[PDB]
Design a protein around this ligand. Structure first.
Ligand SMILES: [Fe+3]
Ligand SMILES: [Fe+3]
Length: 911
DNA sequence: AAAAAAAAA
């Protein structure tokens, strides 16, 4: 039966014309063939073809065939009738009432039509292929279950008339894709990756410009030759689609370590070790763990290892995962200049974007941009509009972003196959591994498991990391590589980690090689004085600390001779108070005071951070800008601050964090450009702690952020040391390990029990969130996107919402400032009162993250933005916090949600 | 009671 072109696949946006289902099908086939050849990493074609146990050319054709069958389910009365169409010649299959999606039809039809071409009826291959294609809008469905011997009919495909056309179309794409034979073998995780591929094919050839063009040259009839021609014409056009979307591979030539960093004069201990010992080890897929301090150039080490693992696996793509948006912003810049220098300066990639992947990237004026428009004229690595979209970010050839963007691949959620696919062709590098908590850790573990089975190499960077965590992460990777999980009797892969140190895991044979194994000698780092740690008891007034006496004593030498010092507090109110205390004291004269926590407007925090890393940081010490200054802060000090302080005062915290904090003490001493006042004899950490009145007691505010047992364990650990200073990095790992491993450090058995149960809560909630282990998804993709009864989180806990303070006078008119000069925008200044990106930028610059709590259940009408803001994705979910201002001009504490709020210019948000 | 992230075809 010659096929009927009357059946459509697209209408909308086409100016009254419709695009025939055959044509869209072949476009998709052609798009997949091109993607397979010009987009996929060489080593991913190799992994995919191995699963299917056939050659790359056959694999590709199979895949092109499948992709051209994705919308076969549209060929039904239920879909076709949505527009005007003459179906007089096709009686039967009357509307069932089911309202069943075209992608579900596809998966319901294919299992029972595919055998007519060679596929095994009831076969594993047949089932997966159908299920995968049914998942093409991001949701997988169950295998079709049926009770009769006529499954086609049982599922609604009962018209012989409609059935010939469904078969004509099946044979048409089969013919155009070279009639490939069915593969012998196919498996879940492979199929899930191919699905992402079929999705990217649908998306690319669905762009209105592409469709409006193809509409000029539709085939004349449904003849084989007209259809062969359409396919070929579409083949011709797909590479321009890759160039326009920014998707071309970025390949970097092999080089030595010094060739790759020519402005690096002295290669480091770490660096010399890795570059010397790893190339022999990197023979194929595998994991490298590197644990080392700051200032040891782990960054340059990782780039080099990534290129090694890259070449070995035929994976030129990169994804670098960062703990924060700020650090991802920094690294994206770093990675860009590296790529500029490294790629052949003659042949710049002008149609290959290096993407930045996080939720605040759109509002980045550097990154965000301001069709075949300007093809081959963009700046190399520049962000493309296409790659701004949706869940496309991980399809960029190189990308840097939050670890969260990688974790979303293994969460039960729509289009997680897309992110799996985008990751599958890359080398993935996760930085700051020691910073992922138990919940994130179970997610990182399922990710590692899935990368392992997909042959993607992984570099894990960490500061000092507990051996149990290191073990978990390498065990998961290995579990994926080898196709089965660990036994209770099987010996652990990592029983000790050293700091500094590194480790390599071969996916194939499962062998773990430590650095100590290949050189007995320890790796040399920057020599530093041992860190002095001193416990100072602090009096307690009304369950809180009276830091008064102690702050006076320890800071007095600073008031005389100068120097930089930092006071770290466990909560915001505590930091807010301490700043008030030193505010009043310093009023009696010299020296500078600063305050940083999370509760400042975005612009003001970027401001405070900048003048702070400026004064205390490397560039300030090198510019002679370092003052002759006291920082008050919360755990913001823990991430991403270039600071060098002469003294640090911290509340008690888990040693891991207390050691991380103390990384600021004399951070840049080796560079003898730095003047330390006389009283600064040693690098020293003063740990504050309540004076007790038999297992240590701590303020409730502290035990709300850290587990009491953990505090107790750390206190005991440090007391036991009797004033002895900490050799860095010599005693570091020991302390990290023992604070958990040593049970005599926990005298309060009830609290230690509550701590382990809390961690059990975290791991278990994560275990519910993630997709199945690759071995559980072998013959069935359905649990990848299955959930019932809300979006699943990449981080544990209640989360935050951004708030926007506005101000009211006694009318009351509403203003954005306390002066009441800048009016509150009901509308934004764009044509037709619509908000621009610039509007959203200047607005989001004033917002503040607030921790979720009871207050959010008690909001009213005047806490919600106007009708107009409901339009903008960026402004929609904001919460307004009113601030009364008197006619005299004073700003008053103002009720919202059952408490009072006050935005102070020096202390930020108070409640 | 910290910090941290987070419309497609
Ligand atoms: Fe579709
Ligand atoms: Fe489609």
């Amino acid at each position: 039966p010659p096929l009927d072109l009357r059946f459509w696949a697209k209408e909308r946006g086409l100016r009254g014309k419709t695009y025939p289902l055959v044509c869209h099908s072949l476009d998709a086939a052609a798009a997949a063939l091109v993607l397979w050849n010009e987009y996929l990493s060489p080593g991913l074609r190799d992994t995919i073809a191995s699963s299917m146990e056939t050659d790359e050319e056959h694999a590709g054709h199979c895949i092109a065939f499948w992709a051209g069958l994705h919308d076969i389910g549209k060929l039904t009365r239920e879909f076709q009738q949505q527009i005007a169409i003459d179906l007089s010649a096709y009686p039967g299959e009357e509307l069932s009432g089911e309202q069943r999606s075209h992608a579900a039809a596809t998966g319901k039809w294919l299992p029972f039509a595919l055998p007519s071409l060679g596929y095994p009826n009831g076969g594993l291959v047949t089932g997966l292929v159908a299920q995968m294609l049914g998942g093409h809008h991001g949701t997988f469905h169950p295998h079709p279950s049926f009770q009769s011997r006529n499954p086609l009919a049982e599922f609604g495909f009962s018209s012989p008339h409609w059935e010939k056309q469904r078969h004509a179309l099946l044979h048409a794409v089969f013919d155009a894709t070279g009639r490939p034979t069915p593969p012998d073998m196919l498996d879940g995780p492979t199929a899930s990756v191919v699905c992402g591929l079929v999705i990217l094919a649908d998306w690319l050839v669905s762009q209105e410009d592409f469709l409006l063009e193809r509409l000029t040259s539709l085939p004349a009839d449904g003849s084989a030759s007209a259809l062969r021609a359409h396919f070929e014409t579409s083949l011709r056009r797909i590479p321009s689609l890759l160039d326009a979307a920014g998707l071309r591979p970025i390949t970097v030539p092999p080089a030595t370590f010094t060739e790759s960093f020519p402005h690096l004069s002295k290669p480091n201990g770490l660096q010399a070790s890795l570059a010397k010992h790893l190339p022999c080890l990197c023979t194929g897929p595998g994991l490298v763990l590197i644990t080392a301090p700051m200032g040891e150039g782990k960054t340059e080490a990782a780039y080099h290892v990534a290129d090694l693992l890259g070449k070995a696996t035929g994976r030129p793509g990169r994804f670098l995962a960062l703990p924060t948006m700020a650090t991802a912003d920094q690294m994206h810049t770093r990675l860009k200049e590296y790529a500029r220098y490294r790629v052949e300066n003659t042949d710049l990639p002008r149609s290959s974007t290096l993407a930045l992947l996080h939720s605040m990237a759109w509002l980045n004026p550097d990154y965000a941009p301001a069709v075949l428009s300007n093809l081959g004229h963009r700046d190399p690595f520049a962000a493309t509009d296409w790659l701004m979209g949706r869940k496309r970010g991980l399809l960029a050839p190189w990308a840097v972003g939050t670890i969260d963007q990688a974790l979303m691949a293994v969460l039960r959620a729509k289009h997680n196959a897309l992110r799996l696919f985008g990751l599958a062709g890359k080398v993935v590098v996760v930085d700051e591994a020691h910073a992922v908590d138990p919940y994130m850790q179970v997610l990182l573990e399922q990710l590692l498991r899935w990368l392992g089975t997909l042959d993607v190499p992984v570099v894990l960077l960490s500061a000092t990391l507990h051996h149990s965590i290191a073990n978990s992460l390498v065990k998961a990777y290995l579990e994926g590589a080898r196709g089965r999980r660990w036994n209770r009797s099987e010996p652990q892969p990592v029983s000790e980690v050293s700091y500094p140190g590194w480790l390599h895991v071969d996916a194939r044979i499962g062998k773990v090689t430590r650095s100590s194994d290949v050189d007995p000698l320890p790796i040399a780092t920057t020599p530093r004085k041992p860190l002095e740690v001193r416990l100072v008891d602090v009096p307690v007034k009304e369950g809180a600390l009276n830091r008064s006496t102690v702050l006076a004593k320890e800071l007095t030498p600073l008031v005389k001779q100068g120097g930089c010092a930092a006071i770290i507090c466990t909560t915001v109110a505590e930091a807010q108070g301490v700043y008030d205390l030193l505010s009043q004291w310093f009023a009696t004269l010299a020296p500078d005071l600063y305050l940083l926590h999370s509760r400042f407007p975005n612009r003001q925090r970027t401001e405070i951070t900048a003048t702070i890393v400026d004064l205390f940081g490397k560039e300030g010490a090198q510019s002679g800008r370092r003052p002759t200054a006291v920082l008050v802060a919360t755990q913001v000090v823990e991430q991403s601050l270039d600071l060098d302080v002469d003294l640090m005062i911290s509340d008690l915290a888990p040693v891991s964090l207390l050691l991380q904090r103390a990384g600021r003490c004399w951070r840049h001493e080796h560079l003898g450009i730095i003047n330390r006042p006389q009283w600064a004899k040693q690098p020293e950490l003063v740990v504050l702690t309540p004076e007790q009145n038999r297992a240590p007691w701590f303020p409730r505010s502290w035990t709300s952020v850290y587990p009491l047992a953990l505090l107790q364990r750390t206190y005991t650990l440090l007391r036991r040391r009797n004033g002895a200073p900490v050799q860095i990095p010599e005693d570091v790992q020991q302390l990290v390990d023992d604070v958990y491993d040593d049970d005599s450090l926990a005298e309060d058995l009830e609290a230690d029990m509550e701590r382990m149960g809390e961690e059990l809560a975290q791991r278990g909630l994560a275990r519910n969130a993630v997709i199945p282990d690759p071995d559980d998804a072998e013959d069935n993709l359905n649990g990848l996107t299955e959930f019932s009864f809300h979006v699943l989180a990449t981080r544990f806990g209640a989360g935050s919402v951004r708030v926007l303070c506005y101000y009211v006078d006694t009318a009351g008119n509403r203003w954005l400032d306390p002066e009441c000069t800048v009016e509150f925008p009901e509308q934004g200044t764009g044509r037709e009162g619509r908000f621009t990106m610039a509007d959203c930028r200047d607005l989001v610059a004033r917002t503040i993250p607030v921790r979720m709590g009871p207050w959010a259940s008690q909001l009213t009408e005047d806490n919600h933005p106007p009708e107009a803001w409901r339009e903008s994705f960026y402004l929609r979910d904001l919460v307004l916090i009113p601030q009364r201002v008197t006619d005299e001009g004073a700003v008053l504490p103002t009720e919202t949600g059952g408490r009072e709020w006050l935005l102070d210019p020096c202390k930020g948000l108070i409640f």
